[PDB]
Amino acid sequence: LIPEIDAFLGCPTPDAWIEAALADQETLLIDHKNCEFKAASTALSLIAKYNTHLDLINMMSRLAREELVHHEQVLRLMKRRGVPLRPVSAGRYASGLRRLVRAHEPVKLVDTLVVGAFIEARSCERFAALVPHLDEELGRFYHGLLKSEARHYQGYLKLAHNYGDEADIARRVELVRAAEMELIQSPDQELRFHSGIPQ
| Burial of 165 per CB tally in 10 Å (0-12, 13-18, 19+) | exposed
Give the β-pairing of 187-188 and 197-198: parallel
24 is in an annotated binding site: no
Q: Does 138 bind ligand AR (CB under 6 A)?
A: yes
Closer Cβ to Fe ion, 36 or 125, answer by number: 36
| Contact residue for ligand AR among 10, 14, 18, 25 (CB under 6 A) | 25
Q: What is the DSSP letter of 198?
A: E
Closer Cβ to a copy of itself, 79 or 98, answer by number: 79
Minimum distance between the CB of residue 32 and Fe ion, rounded to whole angstroms? Answer: 9
Minimum distance between the CB of residue 7 and ligand AR, rounded to whole angstroms? Answer: 26
67 is in an annotated binding site: yes
Minimum distance between the CB of residue 91 and ligand AR, rounded to whole angstroms? Answer: 15
Collect all residues with Cβ–Cβ distance below 8 Å to 16 and sequence separation of at least 6.
197, 198
- Residues interacting with Fe ion, by CB under 5 A? 36, 67, 70, 152
Amino acid, single-letter form, for residue 13: T
CA triple 174-131-94, angle to 5 deg? 35
Report the C-alpha gap between 195 and 51 in whole angstroms: 33
Neighbours of 61 (CB within 10 A): 12
Q: Does 65 bind Cl ion (CB under 5 A)?
A: yes
Closer Cβ to ligand AR, 5 or 138, answer by number: 138
97 is in an annotated binding site: no
28 binds, among Fe ion, Cl ion, ligand AR, none (CB under 5 to 8 A by kind): ligand AR
4 is in an annotated binding site: no
| Burial of 54 per CB tally in 10 Å (0-12, 13-18, 19+) | exposed
- Asked if 110 and 164 count as a contact pair (C-beta separation under 8 A), the reply is yes
| Contact residue for ligand AR among 28, 109, 124, 160 (CB under 6 A) | 28
Q: Please enumerate, by residue number, every residue annotated as part of a binding site.
A: 6, 9, 19, 36, 67, 70, 120, 149, 152
Q: Please enumerate, by residue number, every residue annotated as part of a binding site for Ca(2+).
A: 6, 9, 19
